[PDB]
Amino acid sequence: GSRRYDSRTTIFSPEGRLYQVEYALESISHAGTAIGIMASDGIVLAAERKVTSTLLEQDTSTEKLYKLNDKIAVAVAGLTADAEILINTARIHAQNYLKTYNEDIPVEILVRRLSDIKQGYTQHGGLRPFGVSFIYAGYDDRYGYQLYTSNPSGNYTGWKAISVGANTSAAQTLLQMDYKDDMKVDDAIELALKTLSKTTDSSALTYDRLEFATIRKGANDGEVYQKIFKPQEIKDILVKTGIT
Amino acid sequence: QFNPYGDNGGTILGIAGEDFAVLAGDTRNITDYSINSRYEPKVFDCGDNIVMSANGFAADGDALVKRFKNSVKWYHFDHNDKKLSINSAARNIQHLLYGKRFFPYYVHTIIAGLDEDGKGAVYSFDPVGSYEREQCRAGGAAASLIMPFLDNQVNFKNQYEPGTNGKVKKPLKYLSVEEVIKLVRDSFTSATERHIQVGDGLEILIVTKDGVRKEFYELKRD
Amino acid sequence: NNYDGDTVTFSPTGRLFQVEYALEAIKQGSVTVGLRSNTHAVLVALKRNADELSSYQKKIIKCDEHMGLSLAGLAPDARVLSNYLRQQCNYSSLVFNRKLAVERAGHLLCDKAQKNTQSYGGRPYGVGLLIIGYDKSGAHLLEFQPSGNVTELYGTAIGARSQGAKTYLERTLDTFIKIDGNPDELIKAGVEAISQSLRDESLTVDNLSIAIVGKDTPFTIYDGEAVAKYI
Amino acid sequence: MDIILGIRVQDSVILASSKAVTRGISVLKDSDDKTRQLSPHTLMSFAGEAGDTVQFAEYIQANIQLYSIREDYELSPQAVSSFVRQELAKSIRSRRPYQVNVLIGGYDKKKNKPELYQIDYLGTKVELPYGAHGYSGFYTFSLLDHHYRPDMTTEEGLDLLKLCVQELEKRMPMDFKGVIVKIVDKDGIRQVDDF
Amino acid sequence: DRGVSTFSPEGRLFQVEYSLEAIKLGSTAIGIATKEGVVLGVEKRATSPLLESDSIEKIVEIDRHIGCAMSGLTADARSMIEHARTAAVTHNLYYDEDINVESLTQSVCDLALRFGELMSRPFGVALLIAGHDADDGYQLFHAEPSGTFYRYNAKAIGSGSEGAQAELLNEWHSSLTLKEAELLVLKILKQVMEEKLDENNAQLSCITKQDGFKIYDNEKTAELIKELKEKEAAE
Amino acid sequence: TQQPIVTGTSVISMKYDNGVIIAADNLGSYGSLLRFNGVERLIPVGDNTVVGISGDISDMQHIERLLKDLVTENAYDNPLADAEEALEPSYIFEYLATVMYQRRSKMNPLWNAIIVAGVQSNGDQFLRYVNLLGVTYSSPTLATGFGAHMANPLLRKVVDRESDIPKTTVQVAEEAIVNAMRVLYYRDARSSRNFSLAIIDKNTGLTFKKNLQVENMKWDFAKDIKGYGTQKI
Amino acid sequence: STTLAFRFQGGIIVAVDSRATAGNWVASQTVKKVIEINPFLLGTMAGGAADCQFWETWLGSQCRLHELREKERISVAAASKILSNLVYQYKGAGLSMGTMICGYTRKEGPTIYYVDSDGTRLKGDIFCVGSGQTFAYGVLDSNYKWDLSVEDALYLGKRSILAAAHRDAYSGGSVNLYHVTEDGWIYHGNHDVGELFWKVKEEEGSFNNVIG
Amino acid sequence: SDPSSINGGIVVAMTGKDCVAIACDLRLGSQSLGVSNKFEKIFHYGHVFLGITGLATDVTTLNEMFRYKTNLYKLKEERAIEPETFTQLVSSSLYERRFGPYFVGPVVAGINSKSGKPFIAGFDLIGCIDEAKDFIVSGTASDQLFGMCESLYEPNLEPEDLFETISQALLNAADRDALSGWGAVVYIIKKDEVVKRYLKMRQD
Amino acid sequence: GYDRALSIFSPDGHIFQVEYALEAVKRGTCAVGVKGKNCVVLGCERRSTLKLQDTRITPSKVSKIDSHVVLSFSGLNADSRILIEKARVEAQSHRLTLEDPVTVEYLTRYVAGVQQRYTQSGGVRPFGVSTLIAGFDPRDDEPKLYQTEPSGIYSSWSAQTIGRNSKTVREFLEKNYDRKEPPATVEECVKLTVRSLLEVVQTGAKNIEITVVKPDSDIVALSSEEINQYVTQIEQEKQE
Ligand SMILES: *[B]([O])([O])[C]([C][C]([C])[C])[N]C(=O)[C]([C]C1=[C][C]=[C][C]=[C]1)[N]C(=O)C1=[C]N=[C][C]=N1
């Protein structure tokens, strides 16, 4: 019957590893690098678009940085289509929480929910896992500014500075070198771009090959503003930091 | 509007002796002011030395007896031909009745036989499954006519010993099978006189250690 | 070989190996004999024990007052099929006030076993049955195979070394069919038939299992000292 | 059940609830506590149909306690009240609705403010300085309209509550066998054992 | 791969035969039936000395008149015990009586072959079900994952089973007392166990008509072990 | 739950020494309107059973189709379908009785009253009743609707108990049935003159008589009846 | 139906009447309105006979399963809540039950729970349930103390049922007494009201209204 | 018994010259008993304003529902929802509960951000759209509001004049209804400024 | 639905999927449990391959199931969340119906039952997680420590360890833990737990987590400095 053709996506290897999770992580390692850096007065999200074209309409394009709600955003690394399935689920979960409790969802609770969905695909159902790794950048009134990452295994962890996708080993070493706890957003912006500029497989880092975003309390008085950078604004910050 | 219930009349009577038990019932079957049958058996031998009758709405009565007889059959299959004791049969019947708690079997059920010590046993049920072991019970249409007579003539209620004037009760001496059958016959003769749904014939099933015996007697046909 | 992984696969010669492997489980089972006359039908079964401390596995199951069978192979599969027969016999009685015909009982068993041989996921039954009964057309004996094939017979035997008893019955055909109105002599012939399948061991008091059904005889099973008469 | 009252003062919320339980003809009990602690700084009183009241309260209690363990954090009174409202708003269009009215008294440790929420069985929520369910409000709101201030102390709140209970004991036909009073503030929940 | 409910060329179910191999790896359990009662005994087999041995529960009560011992993948036995307990109590509810030991065993064995592609595999545990009823008296049954159950005068299951069964073959007779049976289980357990038998790594139990099913205290078993040592040294 | 629309009135029957007789008129009424005048309400099953049906005609036609299907089903894989394993009256009745009680239990009844008349394999007379409620009973005489009130009294004068059955011949029994049908035509406002009659004898088999009419009627005395009391002209 | 139960120094007293009626017709005078759930738990029965019987013998099966699974006696709180949660599922369907679940454990001491078919579950010291509950309450409330002897407590319960048996038309027959202690319940006999009334009247000097 | 008049309340909306106005009372009651005088019935999602009268639990539920839906809309569309589009969303959402409806009387008000055109709309409890040029009314004193609006209203009123007209329409209508009043709020809405005014009125 | 039998027997009588789930536990960070006379201590390893971590928000290794019971684990982190959630739900459900918090044995029996169910259910793989469940029964001062594993078997332990290099720390505990006289105080119990982890951990900095559970819902997690003081005292005694 049908058993003959079943790949068995949810089994252990003799070494106790989940085959499909490991292979999904291998897929993600070829995706464009995404970096998240948390500062005292905000969070930076930077990400590299993969080998683009001059005929790509950049100003209306979005492949890396997505808005989950007014307080939380994500950077994507992996299959974009898989990510959008999860992103829409996460957007709904946030709204469900807001309707139930009349309060914005705490960052970790949203992260745990998405991570639990990923876990399910590794334990039951016989389906392939989502080939996606997220960097969650968000704010709530309990823990303040927070950075998390989740991967196809459904495991998630918190970070001060973190990278996903390609060249994470090189990127993580550079971040570990220059990162300090008393750092500010403007400094973190510079660190993120400098790290991408060194780890990139491209010849030079330009505005048309980047997506950029900040989450700042740099909003008029006690509140948080999300800023998805426009192409011209990415071009200006590249000149300001002295990369182009 | 459709009414799923009906009333087929009739009356039944169970009496437990010292080493025997009887279950009697008239053979008349009716609707409203008409006679359906002058001889429609109402008391049944269900095997394992147990007799049963489910009086009231005959369709529900036949259904219940049929399902209990079935339960006896499967009890033998499932438990190595073990004899179903009268107490176990009674509990089983409770679950059959309560299973239709919200659409009840519209019957008054009585079973009779011998307990595991060989003594006479009668059990009585309401429509939704409540039950109780009894020495004496009438059921059905003329139950209200018969029960008081049995309180007086079987349990010697309100009877005392001459000369003492209310001080000493009449002692509860045991009744033979011949004595019980006399009381059953008089109960039904009296019920036939004053209840229009009772008559035609009386069928008595007697249960002893030897088995199940039957006796039939004519009743007035008006 | 490559075509025995499941029941849904024919071999290149048109064989169903999973069904044939299920048939093999019957041959490993203990011997049981069935035979009938015009008045009575008899089952004789050699029960098997695990060791000297153990009991002897029961081989005969009652289905109704007028019908029952003996088994050879996977005993749990016989319990499933006998339970189905009990229900079908019972449906016939409750709905139609009619004792189920032995021939129709065979047809129902055939169709139940068949569904397990054509579908993916399931498996064939691993047991063979000998059904005896007395209905409106007299005494009957059936042989059930888990391939689905059911056959009405005068006498037969299934299980290990069953060929010896089957040959004896084939010789005695003209004699035992005439044993009418004599249950003890019909059982004697059945006990003598199953004896042709014995090696090393002999028929003891807790080894032998006999069942009979007839004209004025409900299906009853004899075990223990009740069969010492026939040893 | 019958009478449940609530009043929010300067630094605390006070809930008063009757002790009587009446099965038609007889008063079966005169010491019944018509409340459940949902969290250390949140208390819910309740009144409605028999069985449904306790079943609903304990169900809400279990859910909030589950949330507390999962997140190692206490939900704000506003958040708890919204959760409760949604459950009742869901319930009203069910096969058999919960016939339960509630008051939720809580102290928000973040804002350092007491908060009182009134919710009926339909899922109708309002935040109030003082509230009541059933026929209680018909007698008590006029008194509270006259005497209440936002800057009252807890002791002044209890005195104003005694004036409410005295009026109820004078003009209500049913003997509700007095009230159990509980205070909710920054230090948690405590019961006034003499009232 | 291949079906879970597949027959081998010899006419056996692969999965059932493989589960029997798992049972052979399990700790030893022995049962002996007498006219004065049935005795059940098990090897606890703790994997480490830091493991509190009294938490090892390989003998279990099903009802007051029925006990049970296990051997193999003991985690699999929990749902079987739950079913057995429910079946025993349910029958009492429906019939106002104790359930026959055989009928209880049959109910447990009905679960066995409910596997396919229901549960995904057979049970990896064998059970010794011992009890008493009015009809057939003191009884001992061996319930396998094949769905088959045999009655036994005496039976051993687990890693030391064939060695223990041969010993039970010689020792058992129809006139054994309860005390004689207790010592006999201890004797045979001590023979097949790897570690030295004491009250902490072995457990006894019995079922009598009067007192019902009882798991023995470690103090009570310790005395029977001491009584055993002396009677073996007596000749 | 429904209401009956097109309906059939009384079915009457009785036992006699060698078998059973059953009868029913050929009318299908639509309330007070005598709508359909050619409706057969006796339906034979094999050569040993006749099922008489009263009440809702649409449900009767459904039952007729069930019985037709029952015969077909019994023949399947049955070499003795026309011999030892033929349908008995007792089998046919029990089936109908099962269906009737099941349908009442779903609160969607077959709005009928049914009498199954026939002779068994051993020659025994079979006569049993069942209706929309699943109620069943047997008697030497059986009748539905108005028949119960008017026919039974007349038929019970012939066979009053079980011991009167061997003393009752087929000629005496048929005479009583035919007279009862006349009485029903006098007195039932939903009856017709035309009827069908069926005899099932253990010796002569099934005799099905169609297009019978009520005859020998007394009406002449009507001419003398004038007014409602005091009127003379 | 008149059933009562009350906590005191010597544990719990449970007392019930024996009558069952269908309208004005007295169906039985020998009904067992106390259920022996286990050697430590008792349940009282008021309302529908079948509902009470069925679900309280069912309760005993659930309690037996608990102590098989947990190797420990079930608490009175847990036992009562199993029944209340069950009847709450059936709320609206028309079950008719008024019951006291009475027992004694180490952790709780003597405990009584009133359980109801509307879903009501109440812990308390004294409860009277049934058509004649008001009559029994009168005698109890005026004579109840914590410091009663087992002998005096048993009599108060017996007397309170008698009071209700006399006045309430749907109560009577006989009185069944139970006494629940640290070591289990103890049956204290069936007492016919037809003999008990005249005995109490003579000895106690009560019922001077009635002539004897 | 009648769900639409248990709690009470009213909402009115009007158009002016390059502006719109929406107003409501503040009462929530349980039939005769006044419970709350701070129960606002006007909500806003971006620049689109929604007033809701009727059963109060459904008023709250629908607000939470449309906040939910307009937030998802904005995330996907990358722009705020417009009045014309929101009107269709309200209608769709109400009609999906055709045979188990929310007992409400919604009112939409706002200015289209691109065209600058003033927009108002009303609905029945199950989705029918009333898109009037002049004014929309809703609630327990809708008859009263119709009478006030039909006489007081004139087209092309300036924002500060429109305030006076709508305020007098609400106040005098509420005072002839037992289940309305206990305070009032008026929103004046221009293309890029919105003023909110609480009105002084009789508290009976 | 996906019904495929993933956990099945092999010719030698082994269920490989259950056994491979144990290999995932072997890979997981080390966890240890030690019970004293009036307390239980749960020690957990944090691998220092991950720095630049935010320790405020990162999921902690020890999880409260109720106010009186805790659960630590070794194996797949994502899998552990599912067991923890189910356990937390069951704990509240038990309080709701029985009107009493769970016993430590009961909560263990439930979690073990869930693990077992995933070894003979179609379409699912076993949990790659072993747990240590510790706490005190309601109104009881006797310490409780239980272990579970993917197969579903569970048992009580005076002291136990799971995860990578658990063979080494179990060796340490077997010679250092005396049953006749367990760690009498909190200090002695924590010290023995930190000592056992120091056999395996590497640096005694942010690599050791300690959680102390005492009777009557008294649970507290030790800080870096508090643990660092134990690390300092142990090695200073060792220099001799
Ligand atoms: B008691 O009055 O509640 C009594 C106890 C019952 C458990 C045996 N109930 C009844 O007698 C009821 C009638 C009733 C009387 C008064 C109040 C409520 C109910 N009788 C029955 O349920 C019943 C059952 N079977 C036959 C006759 N009556």
Ligand SMILES: [Mg+2]
């Ligand atoms: Mg009469």
